[PDB]
Amino acid sequence: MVTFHTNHGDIVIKTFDDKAPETVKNFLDYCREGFYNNTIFHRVINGFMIQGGGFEPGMKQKATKEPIKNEANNGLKNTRGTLAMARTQAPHSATAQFFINVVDNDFLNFSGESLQGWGYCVFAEVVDGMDVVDKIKGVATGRSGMHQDVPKEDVIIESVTVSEHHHHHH
Known part of the structure; x- marks a missing residue:
């Protein structure tokens, strides 16, 4: 599990390690590196999703690592409360940015291994x-440069705590 400590409260997530293993490893690596610290939810669209994990206040984009393979072929759907990876139009271009679906966004779901079909990989x-x-x-949201739907007051991921549970059979 991972908890995002935001300036609106805590968001606790469970990762889908079996179904999106590269995506979950990439995400946890950024978490443990402090990458998401002082990043914002920079794209907030009610009725759709909230997106963050790429910019500091002022829309200062953080440098990222190499992008990851799209694991959306895993059959998991972008139902309300799931996390998926944001990306550009190239399916295997996701780096650190993620979003939380706030309704069931069926139109984001994998439908085939093509530009139009690959969809967005759910990993938590x-x-x-x-x-x-x-x-x-x-x-409330507004414009910031070329960006739209940017919260007028910053929604800040102050930090991220990782929680691991280990089991011992006796």
Whole structure:
């Protein structure tokens, strides 16, 4: 599990390690490196999703690592509360940016291994703090340079805590 500590409260997520293993490793690596610290939810669209993990306040884009393979072929759907990776039009271009679906966004789902079909890879789901997600999705937004739907007051991921559970059979 991972918790995003935001200035609107905590968002707790469970990763889908079996179904998106490269994506989950990439995500946890950024978490442990402090990459998401002081990043913002820079693209918030009520009724759609909230997107973050790429910019500091002022839309200062952080340098990222090499992009990852799209694992959306895993059959998982972009239902409300799932996390998927943001990307540009190239399917295997995701780096650190992710989004939380705030409704079921069926139009984002993998339908085939093509530019139009690959869709968006679901790799985790919110397990506590959907109320915080629902707060964030509702904030006021406006323009910032070329970017739209940018919260007028920064929605900040202050940091990220990782929680691991180990089991011992006796």
